[PDB]
Design an enzyme around this catalytic site. Structure first.
Site, mmCIF file in Angstrom:
data_model
loop_
_atom_site.group_PDB
_atom_site.id
_atom_site.type_symbol
_atom_site.label_atom_id
_atom_site.label_comp_id
_atom_site.label_asym_id
_atom_site.label_seq_id
_atom_site.Cartn_x
_atom_site.Cartn_y
_atom_site.Cartn_z
ATOM 1 N N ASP A 181 54.195 -67.635 -9.551
ATOM 2 C CA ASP A 181 53.652 -67.753 -10.294
ATOM 3 C C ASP A 181 52.133 -67.154 -10.770
ATOM 4 O OD1 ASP A 181 53.686 -70.762 -11.947
ATOM 5 O OD2 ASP A 181 51.560 -70.244 -11.159
ATOM 6 N N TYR A 228 44.130 -66.183 -16.199
ATOM 7 C CA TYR A 228 44.285 -65.862 -13.703
ATOM 8 C C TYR A 228 43.734 -64.970 -14.666
ATOM 9 C CZ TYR A 228 47.524 -70.012 -13.173
ATOM 10 O OH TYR A 228 47.253 -71.018 -13.015
ATOM 11 N N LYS A 250 53.198 -67.858 -18.272
ATOM 12 C CA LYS A 250 52.894 -69.257 -18.991
ATOM 13 C C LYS A 250 51.457 -69.225 -19.953
ATOM 14 C CE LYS A 250 51.217 -71.567 -14.797
ATOM 15 N NZ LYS A 250 50.902 -70.682 -13.857
ATOM 16 N N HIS A 308 51.682 -73.880 -20.861
ATOM 17 C CA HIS A 308 50.305 -74.167 -19.409
ATOM 18 C C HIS A 308 49.664 -75.479 -19.745
ATOM 19 C CE1 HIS A 308 48.008 -72.013 -16.692
ATOM 20 N NE2 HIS A 308 47.922 -72.930 -16.607
HETATM 21 N N1 LIG Z 1 49.805 -74.856 -14.119
HETATM 22 C C1 LIG Z 1 48.943 -75.019 -14.438
HETATM 23 O O1 LIG Z 1 48.362 -75.935 -15.239
HETATM 24 C C2 LIG Z 1 48.230 -74.823 -13.185
HETATM 25 C C3 LIG Z 1 46.961 -75.510 -11.351
HETATM 26 C C4 LIG Z 1 46.483 -74.865 -10.858
HETATM 27 C C5 LIG Z 1 47.263 -74.293 -9.742
HETATM 28 N N2 LIG Z 1 48.531 -73.696 -10.740
HETATM 29 C C6 LIG Z 1 49.385 -72.857 -9.512
HETATM 30 O O2 LIG Z 1 50.094 -73.131 -8.373
HETATM 31 C C7 LIG Z 1 49.657 -72.421 -7.420
HETATM 32 C C8 LIG Z 1 48.887 -72.626 -5.965
HETATM 33 O O3 LIG Z 1 48.106 -73.944 -6.700
HETATM 34 P P1 LIG Z 1 45.675 -73.879 -6.234
HETATM 35 O O4 LIG Z 1 45.943 -72.224 -6.064
HETATM 36 O O5 LIG Z 1 45.264 -74.114 -6.585
HETATM 37 O O6 LIG Z 1 46.186 -74.280 -4.773
HETATM 38 P P2 LIG Z 1 46.706 -74.179 -3.338
HETATM 39 O O7 LIG Z 1 48.036 -73.620 -3.496
HETATM 40 O O8 LIG Z 1 46.708 -75.787 -2.750
HETATM 41 O O9 LIG Z 1 45.568 -74.274 -1.800
HETATM 42 C C9 LIG Z 1 45.884 -72.601 -2.294
HETATM 43 C C10 LIG Z 1 43.935 -72.646 -0.972
HETATM 44 O O10 LIG Z 1 44.399 -73.130 0.307
HETATM 45 C C11 LIG Z 1 44.321 -71.718 1.520
HETATM 46 N N3 LIG Z 1 45.459 -71.781 1.940
HETATM 47 C C12 LIG Z 1 46.430 -71.260 1.671
HETATM 48 N N4 LIG Z 1 47.181 -71.272 2.570
HETATM 49 C C13 LIG Z 1 46.904 -72.037 3.998
HETATM 50 C C14 LIG Z 1 47.281 -71.919 5.118
HETATM 51 N N5 LIG Z 1 48.134 -71.297 5.665
HETATM 52 N N6 LIG Z 1 46.353 -72.451 6.045
HETATM 53 C C15 LIG Z 1 44.606 -72.031 5.414
HETATM 54 N N7 LIG Z 1 43.925 -72.770 3.644
HETATM 55 C C16 LIG Z 1 45.356 -72.080 3.189
HETATM 56 C C17 LIG Z 1 44.478 -70.528 0.275
HETATM 57 O O11 LIG Z 1 43.163 -68.918 0.658
HETATM 58 P P3 LIG Z 1 44.092 -67.696 0.925
HETATM 59 O O12 LIG Z 1 43.604 -68.052 -0.265
HETATM 60 O O13 LIG Z 1 42.006 -67.415 1.445
HETATM 61 O O14 LIG Z 1 44.080 -67.568 2.196
HETATM 62 C C18 LIG Z 1 43.453 -71.266 -1.237
HETATM 63 O O15 LIG Z 1 41.955 -71.119 -0.197
HETATM 64 C C19 LIG Z 1 48.526 -71.525 -8.054
HETATM 65 O O16 LIG Z 1 47.735 -70.744 -7.670
HETATM 66 C C20 LIG Z 1 48.788 -71.441 -9.512
HETATM 67 O O17 LIG Z 1 49.990 -70.285 -9.268
HETATM 68 C C21 LIG Z 1 48.967 -73.817 -11.753
HETATM 69 O O1 LIG Z 2 44.906 -74.182 -15.900
HETATM 70 C C1 LIG Z 2 45.213 -74.087 -14.178
HETATM 71 O O2 LIG Z 2 46.283 -73.053 -14.190
HETATM 72 C C2 LIG Z 2 44.129 -73.719 -13.143
HETATM 73 O O3 LIG Z 2 43.102 -73.923 -13.731
HETATM 74 C C3 LIG Z 2 41.959 -73.112 -14.953
HETATM 75 C C4 LIG Z 2 42.301 -71.182 -14.086
HETATM 76 C C5 LIG Z 2 42.031 -70.753 -15.561
HETATM 77 F F1 LIG Z 2 42.422 -69.675 -14.937
HETATM 78 C C6 LIG Z 2 41.095 -70.929 -16.614
HETATM 79 C C7 LIG Z 2 40.890 -72.463 -16.363
HETATM 80 C C8 LIG Z 2 40.747 -73.404 -15.829
HETATM 81 C C9 LIG Z 2 41.213 -75.288 -15.222
HETATM 82 S S1 LIG Z 2 39.706 -75.570 -16.000
HETATM 83 N N1 LIG Z 2 42.797 -75.730 -15.634
HETATM 84 C C10 LIG Z 2 42.037 -76.752 -16.033
HETATM 85 C C11 LIG Z 2 42.083 -77.295 -17.623
HETATM 86 C C12 LIG Z 2 42.833 -76.417 -18.898
HETATM 87 C C13 LIG Z 2 42.915 -76.742 -19.693
HETATM 88 C C14 LIG Z 2 43.238 -77.902 -20.605
HETATM 89 BR BR1 LIG Z 2 44.275 -78.373 -21.499
HETATM 90 C C15 LIG Z 2 42.968 -78.778 -19.167
HETATM 91 C C16 LIG Z 2 42.490 -79.025 -18.330
HETATM 92 F F2 LIG Z 2 42.426 -79.930 -16.963
#
Ligand SMILES: NC(=O)c1ccc[n+]([C@@H]2O[C@H](COP(=O)([O-])OP(=O)(O)OC[C@H]3O[C@@H](n4cnc5c(N)ncnc54)[C@H](OP(=O)(O)O)[C@@H]3O)[C@@H](O)[C@H]2O)c1
Ligand SMILES: O=C(O)COc1cc(F)ccc1C(=S)NCc1ccc(Br)cc1F
Ligand SMILES: [Br-]
EC number: 1.1.1.21
Length: 311
Positions: A43, A48, A77, A110
């Site tokens: 993803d 990012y 995205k 996104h």
């Molecule tokens: N579409 C959107 O708007 C949106 C928004 C937010 C996220 N996303 C996608 O969703 C993905 C996952 O969400 P997220 O990055 O917000 O957070 P997450 O996956 O819920 O949590 C990541 C955190 O968990 C830690 N971690 C991972 N595996 C672990 C384990 N086995 N034990 C303890 N800690 C662990 C990681 O640490 P380390 O990395 O230091 O190991 C990191 O600090 C993102 O990276 C992105 O690709 C999409």
């Molecule tokens: O967005 C991600 O994937 C993870 O988050 C982010 C990842 C980035 F690299 C930069 C900003 C964001 C944030 S601040 N996202 C929140 C956000 C953005 C836009 C709008 Br509309 C609402 C909202 F709530």
């Protein structure tokens, strides 16, 4: 079963690696390790600011013949500042260039909101509010449909769309391709039962982001709830001789969701994949669902006044 069938006819791995916040000097190794230990879904997103480094990893594993391109499922995205008709293709192309690919398996809008185009990802007015674009979601969707027809992407979808917004796309006059996926925040403190049932009822596959509660989110606070430390989840993990993260990853899988935990720690990348050899009971599942508090880690004040802000 390791993959779910999408409404475009393709199969999507139910476990992928997230890359938001993965530092550019760590994420190439993270993705190399992920592919070596079995991941087939990554993803990504332009916003990012690490897609080049992700792509170095993907490219090396394709070159080395560790995996075939058809075995990978790469998601990216479209960022908010590219919602305009004449900017969508070049945004997609930039992502392809950076990832070293000639197509994406899935390309998402996104966020439902479009922002003023320019260099800044969050263009603000003098008072701190994001500056919108007047392009609506339906026009941006038509631009996404063209990417399928031009062969740049195999499927299109949405992310962070609320019920009304998904329905708006499904009711689009002359809709050509339905969204395949809606990627939304989902974890035991934000269980999303209403939105998930709606999307599933329409044949849209839901991807759960932040399944571990995003403990590295930049705006975290010491007092905030912590899924990984919740003793009730620890207890379920202990009963299954798994880690808390493994429980938190297995949970959405048994809801027929895709899940995309992020890590840059090689041991954890490997550990997080080891989730296909146990089952949470129905009781475990309902107990985890009961922890919902409607606690949202991904939200942003500067965008709350945008017409299309989803929350
Ligand atoms: N579409 C959107 O708007 C949106 C928004 C937010 C996220 N996303 C996608 O969703 C993905 C996952 O969400 P997220 O990055 O917000 O957070 P997450 O996956 O819920 O949590 C990541 C955190 O968990 C830690 N971690 C991972 N595996 C672990 C384990 N086995 N034990 C303890 N800690 C662990 C990681 O640490 P380390 O990395 O230091 O190991 C990191 O600090 C993102 O990276 C992105 O690709 C999409
Ligand atoms: O967005 C991600 O994937 C993870 O988050 C982010 C990842 C980035 F690299 C930069 C900003 C964001 C944030 S601040 N996202 C929140 C956000 C953005 C836009 C709008 Br509309 C609402 C909202 F709530
Ligand atoms: Br938005």
């Amino acid at each position: 079963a390791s993959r779910i069938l999408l409404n475009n006819g393709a199969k999507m791995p139910i476990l992928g690696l997230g890359t938001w916040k993965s530092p550019p000097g760590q994420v190439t190794e993270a993705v190399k390790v992920a592919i070596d230990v079995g991941y087939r879904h990554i993803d990504c997103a332009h916003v990012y600011q690490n897609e080049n480094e992700v792509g170095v990893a993907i490219q090396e594993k394709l070159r080395e013949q560790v995996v075939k391109r058809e075995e990978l499922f790469i998601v990216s995205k479209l960022w908010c500042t590219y919602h305009e008709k004449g900017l969508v293709k070049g945004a997609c192309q930039k992502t392809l260039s950076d990832l070293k690919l000639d197509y994406l398996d899935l390309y998402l809008i996104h966020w439902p909101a479009g922002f003023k185009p320019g260099k800044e990802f969050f263009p603000l007015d003098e008072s701190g509010n994001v500056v919108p674009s007047d392009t609506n979601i339906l026009d941006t969707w038509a631009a996404m449909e063209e990417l399928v027809d031009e062969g740049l992407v195999k499927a299109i979808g949405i992310s962070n769309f609320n019920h009304l917004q998904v329905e708006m796309i499904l009711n689009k006059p002359g809709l050509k391709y339905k969204p395949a996926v809606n990627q939304i925040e989902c974890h035991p403190y934000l269980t999303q039962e209403k939105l998930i049932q709606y999307c599933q009822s329409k044949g849209i596959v839901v991807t759960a982001y932040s399944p571990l509660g995003s403990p590295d989110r930049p705006w975290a606070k010491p007092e905030d709830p912590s899924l990984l430390e919740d003793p009730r989840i620890k207890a379920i993990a202990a009963k299954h001789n798994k880690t808390t993260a493994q429980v938190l990853i297995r949970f959405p899988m048994q809801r027929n969701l895709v899940v995309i935990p992020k890590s840059v720690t090689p041991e954890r990348i490997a550990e997080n994949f080891k989730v296909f050899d146990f089952e949470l009971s129905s009781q475990d599942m309902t107990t985890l669902l009961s922890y919902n508090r409607n606690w949202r880690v991904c939200a942003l004040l500067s965008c709350t006044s945008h017409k299309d802000y989803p929350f």
